[PDB]
């Protein structure tokens, strides 16, 4: 018998919200009778914009070649880069010969204020050379990014791909536990690259991350191994007409600074496991003498 709708108290504020009763009076004895778009044409982003009339687009206050702080407004009405020439023998012929030492770039310099400033986007023949690089929603570098009962564990310990059970690498225990005593159950997250099972206790993790960069299983090559120093950043993979190439002819003191496609300009060389075994024992021997 809570009965909340019966009592409303309309004489004062109502439902957290305030009504117009405070603004319904005007008797005081104090003075004693004496177009625009959501997105942008420069970076395709939403935010603060300046109103325009000659053009139907909107630009940011800090996305212009002569940028101006929003607090100090420009005098009059501001116009875009090409809006200046929008209202207004060819001028190219005299412009080419007007200046010296710029003749091959005269036409390129002519077209500077005839178009709007914009953020930089990589061309249509750069990103796609590496299949790992894909365009983002707003222009991000996309490489790998996208409290209940025990029922989390059956939803994670069974992938229904082959009707089997995934076992962790550090410990050979799935540890699904029992329904009566679920405290012995351990959550397992799988890898997003090789689907390697991993307990949440073996690797120092405490939560599942599903927004942002995908979790990496720590059984791969380091991305930024540090040894003044050296910052290895790989050489990526090339899918453009098999440009990466495969030339196995030496495999000895190769010194190919990593980046091997192991088999049983840029050049992802081919390596075998016999060579890896041989030069491992060679390095072990040379460490034994020193």
């Amino acid at each position: 018998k809570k009965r909340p709708k019966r009592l409303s108290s309309q004489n004062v504020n109502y439902d957290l919200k305030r009504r117009k009763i405070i603004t319904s009076e005007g008797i005081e004895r104090s003075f004693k009778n004496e177009e625009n778009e959501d997105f942008c044409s420069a970076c395709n982003q939403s935010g603060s914009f300046l109103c325009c009339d000659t053009c139907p687009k909107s630009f940011h206050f800090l996305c212009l070649d002569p940028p101006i702080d929003p607090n100090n407004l420009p005098k009059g009405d501001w116009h875009c880069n090409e809006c200046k020439f929008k209202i207004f023998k060819k001028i190219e012929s005299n412009f080419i010969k007007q200046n010296n030492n710029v003749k091959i770039f005269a036409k390129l310099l002519f077209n500077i204020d005839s178009h709007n400033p914009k953020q930089f986007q990589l061309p249509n023949y750069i990103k796609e050379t590496f299949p790992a690089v894909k365009t983002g929603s707003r222009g991000q570098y996309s490489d790998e990014n996208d409290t209940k009962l025990d029922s989390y564990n059956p939803d994670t310990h069974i992938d229904s791909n082959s009707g089997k059970f995934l076992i962790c690498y550090k410990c050979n225990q799935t540890r699904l536990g029992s329904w009566s005593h679920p405290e012995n159950s351990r959550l397992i997250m799988t890898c997003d690259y090789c689907q390697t099972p991993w307990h949440l206790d073996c690797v120092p993790r405490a939560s599942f991350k599903n927004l942002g960069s995908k979790w990496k299983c720590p059984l791969h090559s380091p991305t930024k191994v540090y040894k003044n120093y050296k910052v290895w950043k790989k050489q990526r993979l090339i899918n453009k007409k098999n440009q990466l190439y495969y030339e196995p002819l030496q495999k000895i003191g190769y010194q190919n600074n990593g980046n091997i496609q192991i088999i049983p300009d840029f050049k992802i060389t081919q390596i075998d496991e016999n060579s890896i075994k041989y030069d491992f024992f060679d390095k072990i021997y040379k460490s034994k003498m020193v």
């Binding site: 090789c194 390697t196 059984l219 791969h220 090559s221 990593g258 091997i260 192991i262 496991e273 890896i276 075994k277 024992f281 072990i284």
Partner: peptide
């Protein structure tokens, strides 16, 4: 001896999805 590493790794890892990364 120092040549038992190969079949030790063959028994332990087994699958080539990780063994190749172990070789790397």
């Amino acid at each position: 001896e120092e040549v038992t590493f190969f079949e030790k790794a063959k028994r332990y890892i087994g699958n080539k999805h990780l063994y190749t990364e172990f070789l790397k």
